[model samples]
Target: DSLSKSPENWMSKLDDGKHLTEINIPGSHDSGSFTLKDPVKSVWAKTQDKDYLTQMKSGVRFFDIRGRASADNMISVHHGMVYLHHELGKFLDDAKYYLSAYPNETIVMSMKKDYDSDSKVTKTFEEIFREYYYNNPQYQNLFYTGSNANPTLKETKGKIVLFNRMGGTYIKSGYGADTSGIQWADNATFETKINNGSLNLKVQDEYKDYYDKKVEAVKNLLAKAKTDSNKDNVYVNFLSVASGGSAFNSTSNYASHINPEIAKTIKANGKARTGWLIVDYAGYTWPGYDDIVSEIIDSNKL
Candidate 1:
């Protein structure tokens, strides 16, 4: 079924006053790497196989965007491998189109600096956002600028909420909204838990050889997230696996192996609670890509 007809469109069904953190959202890891082409054979590099529009249509609300410099000196979306090159405006335009069509939906774009660490590159990146996104009249209104303290859906609907993980040097000068509006933490890249009263949640980003163990950890975390007491918190489970040991260590195989199990686990759990599952190949063709998304959306009914 289309997202508009499915219960997975949780944003439309949710109360307007619900805080973003209080809801369960499906996210994509390395969201813009669908078009990556690397000849060196980095298996775990390409996290997604579909573009932004496909992801949006498939019920993904959160996007993990790693912005870095390309050979042309333009900002491109990059993970371990360069995905696609586009001015920041192109990225915003794609999102704008989606939000325009789906007015009830909200998006969380978690942007971080990737690859290039040069000061000039960082400056150019910040300048692009400042000029292209923050200053441009056509796109400025599409963002959420309110305080991040339990913001309601009414306040964020049809808006792109920016979660800047870049350092203070890039954001201290202010970029459109106050830095306070940008919900960020010092150490968001690695696996960590954020405890906020009954809303405590864990974020796991471990990419190693123990594929089975990683899958089990995610299942356990999902279970904990579904408990009555933990309903208020948000759980971010990164299902992207990586290994430097073997040339055949591809993220697609890892996801293919684990996603079905994840789907099964959610079904068996009886509650279908999958909070913020940032996966590599979301909605893959094999087991059906929307399996976990359906489960996560169904959990809201419970």
Candidate 2:
């Protein structure tokens, strides 16, 4: 008799969790298989599933990690927004870094958000989970090189920006002067550009030069866009998506629709625009004028 066909007979005296049922092979052992004939089997039900929104309401940080295509084609198409649980947040961060350092990779950061309140956070999480049915898609080669992994939702307060293989935007935080020539953190005096806008001319000069150099980086990336080098060199913006009419709205919820349109407009205008978006909490603003820097610091502690 075939062992596979006589599993019940050979296991008649065994308890449900007995080790005798575990399979052993020449080089491997302790393997098991499932033979379900029905379509409603739930593999995840065996794992502990908790309420993330409840955690967030009590000031917990919810990090959700999901696929870019899932966010864009699946979630957005269904008018679904992402809910922050620990696992889903990791996927989002992975997408962000993949776009930043490995743009040629098929993965992208399709969407992200913060849950500052109980109702919004709870409702959003439930809506995404129930509506999208987002399950794990195998992530190919993306790894966490930062401390943002496994962050607590409250301690990990930050935004989730979406990116694709095509790169996203060059957003500068708060209009100022071009200071790229100074240093990575712009510690030196600005010497090479000018700003002629509503903000400080010196600051605007820094902004212009800073973005000009960043624009050149994007231009240089055109040749590498089809390869892995494109992934690591993504240029990100420090501005709020809200500033570009990409703000979060409970009524119309237009950001997903508006972001790409605005991005295309900025590129088409032949002007290198540094997109700036701001999200403020009454007592949670990081100590810098730059959101990127602040987010990096916050994501690390999580």
Candidate 3:
């Protein structure tokens, strides 16, 4: 077997009694933007280097899917206005494929509408999203349709637990967690509660500014996660951010500096719960993010 396949079942070793909030979930910052390698948009849009299946095999459990709705009740993935040349259906199928091989595994998908120009769209985002899941019985059954932020690993086995991040003004139903009421701070570092006021989520998502400040923000959240160690709360520290400038200040540039420092913290805070380390360029050997993912999963000890 290839060395890449080792992490495919990493979570299988975890105790079934553990709650997802109590474990560290490796996340892809923009999970589907790996296809964009163009001159302009790729600099900002392309966050992950691997597709969903590869990411799954690499032990990444959380996916950030941003979509733009089009005709035929289908949604195409995007990073801002630039299409990632991928679709939600393919990603869901990837989850199903991975689930078949490792039923003990669970994946979290954080979906959002990535456009406001509303250009050439026939269906509202919520309508098409319902079509994607709620309208299809099989799709609905494949997901965890509860509102708990702290589902046990056993509860979410072989399923995708949807994390609601956008477009519920039309009403949410039929599938996934109900975090619709929580106000999401855009491109910000903030704290919010979920699971019927039973859990807190500390999120670091500063997507713009001096790149070093992004590093500072991520470290701050990681430190907080280490100190708090609350079973009821979920700590989501984003190790990805992008700033505008020369080619030297691109998304790749940001991750290059951010990920290694994150690795340092990961080692310094050995065996600590780092919660969800949402990242960019995951599994790339260039900046050595593959080890970062491995180390995060290794931190999950009960």
Candidate 4:
């Protein structure tokens, strides 16, 4: 029986407990398979408390994707009803960057405001990971350390939070195919799935429109702020295609909507203007926003 066609097979695997059976079928997050009817919170707590270093010394092996930096467990940690535990690693760093660029500004989400006006930005990766995953024991810490694990706290605005920790090396490449021209995975590396043909044409078009609107909105907001403050602080907005998927048919199947002319203007502004490039991840067949942090940074583009 083909695995894809066998609903009973999927159910049997769920009962076996050999694998983390929490993964919804490869579809949208809203699908029925994604709902949490019952969950074992204790399992995650036990995993985190285990001395991983001891297991490593005993030569106990676990099935992991070789030569890849994928996290050990991809489980969500919820406190009561609030969903926590976002995809750690580069995504977390990128989110931090986005927050840093717009201090005191709010990006509206379904629940709480993501970053506060006073949130620290100059933190090392370890500090960020420990503050969220380690300090909150309900969420299993995917970051592994053979040496020592410790955390510190400092007070700010009458609230105390964890401070410093160490971070691991970000693995450069993995899942994408290795080729030059029009490589499916290669393109995914330098751009988003929306640019690489993951979303349906209509949805992709809609996102493009939204991106344009946001850009214009930012410009107007900056102008108003400059006038109100009576200061010459320059402001610029960044737009980058991260990734998404698409339908079966379309002429511009894999296309990015970033206006090249606007990109050129932003780049030439000479004030270390912030910009994001959607680069493909060769291993994952996905795209990520690459931050151009410094004025000295240069790429293949002329």
Candidate 5:
């Protein structure tokens, strides 16, 4: 591949000494929502087109994975009340497969419990996750599970670093991903720390507002995340808006307007560090938004 092309193994270009929080990562929002293709509800419910594997192949390192504990002892992916026809186990295996194929790469999985399951389920959501995925010996090495959320590239190469949002005793008891510094709030831009202040997080996830406001919030945080003033701070900005109604597809509409706006900034700030960019559509070529993945990955080259 040419230097200008965004390779599948884009992370291989970076030195192993860099911290996980330091890289400019491309991520997917509502990653599993790719399976939702209904003509009616999909206008608002569907967020992504490519599945987990395809996203990875396109150099997407971060994933916004929301799952619900199912009656069959498997974790099913979901977005609000809609089931996305995907399983967490399948995603876990795919992460392992991708990492094995590219040892120099690392994947950051941001997981949370989305939508409530049946009242008949005997165990807690966290318990099912542990028994089905985390505790399974075959997949032990698939995750970093380290207390330091800012672990170096060499330390976490070829592993999934969990950005845990589900609350439980597992993380505090030395059994899970980086614990949340402060619990994330709904429809707001905020800050929190993980790994006991080892990693500073600046998050912008205000999705219910108008598109213009969402763009402003995104750009403000992008400026902060791009500046390495606080070495420990990791910015996570979500370019997804839920304001669109029956008249339009919210996911595409948000991307069509926002991707190009942010793309111009990212291209202008070529050498600056753009944070983990989590977007509704990972790879869209709508006018000014072309090669977004390339722009993010290119900023990481040493």
Candidate 6:
């Protein structure tokens, strides 16, 4: 049976003791910024062409959701351009839909306050989450309440795990210090390699120059993670880059250029050690993009 299927899936074969941190998962970069109205705005932004529901159907377990505070005091998903009509709740509903359909799978949503980081804005964002998601019994049961780094698959199945990238302003509740979700490690550098006990998150975002180096950096990190002693750590590798001044540096172009390299690396090393490869413009239309998700799911066989 394929890993994408529900009810009877490969994840059920895995031991109950294996924590969510230990496994390799496929993720989407800027998971919600799919539509763009202005052509000029598409230069270095618009990471994905498909919506959150499509990404989930394609086997993307992790989502990087960036939000901004709107004038109405609601949180809106923003990339280079604000998805004006779309709100954070829309994406959350998509996750809930997918999880309800696929009981064997789990979703890790990484939420970051991209714009208007003032205390007031942050507090408003927190309140929205608390009122709509955290406090709402319908949604609260769908999330894994454990705040620890290492959580067994049994605890997270059919649940959404929150990864909070915003600091200082977090929702305080019975769940933990921050009810919004788990506090993600700080990454001052573009590419932060974290290896603290059971928490193993290696985030690589080097988007300056030389696209080849960005590809190589992800490969090296994936290789290292495979051989590391602690298999219970979460490793994240970003296969996205953006630059201005030229169309060549556009999100689609850069993703097209590097996606093949990522595929080749995954093919050579196998998915058992690839960790969570966060990608942009992921789909069958982009040639090797679909393989990234397929390979990650195939890793369950190993």
Q: Report lDDT per candidate.
A: 0.64, 0.22, 0.75, 0.22, 0.78, 0.65
Q: In candidate 2, how many clashes are counted?
A: 40
- Kindly indicate the candidate among 3 and 4 with the higher TM-score: 3
The number of clashing residue pairs in each candidate reads 2, 40, 0, 19, 0, 0
Error of 3 at 31 (Å): 0.8
Candidate 2 residue 137 Cα shift, in angstroms, is 18
What digit string (tens of lDDT, one per residue) describes model 1 on residues 30-72?
8887776774544656778878888888788888888775433
Cα lDDT tens digits, model 4, 131-204, are 44444454332222212111111101111111110213221111110111112221111222211222111101
lDDT of model 6, residue 166: 52
Taking the tens digit of each residue's C-alpha lDDT, what string does model 6 give over 123-242?
A: 566666656665677666767776555667778878887765654334432112242333444321133222223353556656564676777777777787777647555667777765
lDDT tens string, model 5, 158-250? 998777767743653221243332468789999866566666678899988787788899989888876665658888889887745466546
My TM-score estimates for the predictions, one after another, are 0.80, 0.20, 0.89, 0.23, 0.92, 0.82
Q: After superposition, how far is residue 74 of candidate 6 from its true place, in Å?
A: 1.8
Task: Indicate whether candidate 2 or candidate 5 has the larger lDDT.
Answer: 5
Report lDDT (Cα) of residue 200, candidate 6.
Answer: 38
lDDT of 1 at 26: 73
Locate the minimum summed-lDDT window of 10 residues in model 4. Answer: 149-158
The residue pairs found clashing in candidate 5 are none
Question: Which candidate should be chosen as best, given TM-score against the real structure?
Answer: 5
**Model 1 stretches with alpha carbons more than 4 Å out:** 1-10, 37-42, 69-74, 81-83, 117-131, 169-201, 228-232, 243-245, 287-290
Estimate, for each residue in 1-302, the C-alpha lDDT of model 2 and write its tens digit: 32222211212222223110011100000000011122222121111122322212212121222222233223221111322223344434433443344232122122222222233233343235323332324332232212221212122112222221111212221111122211122322122221122221111111112323433332332222222221112222221111121222311122222222323433343322221111112012123222221222122110
Top candidate when judged by lDDT against the true structure: 5
- Higher-TM-score candidate among 2 and 3? 3
Whichever of 4 and 6 has more TM-score, that candidate is 6
- Which should have the higher TM-score, number 5 or number 6? 5
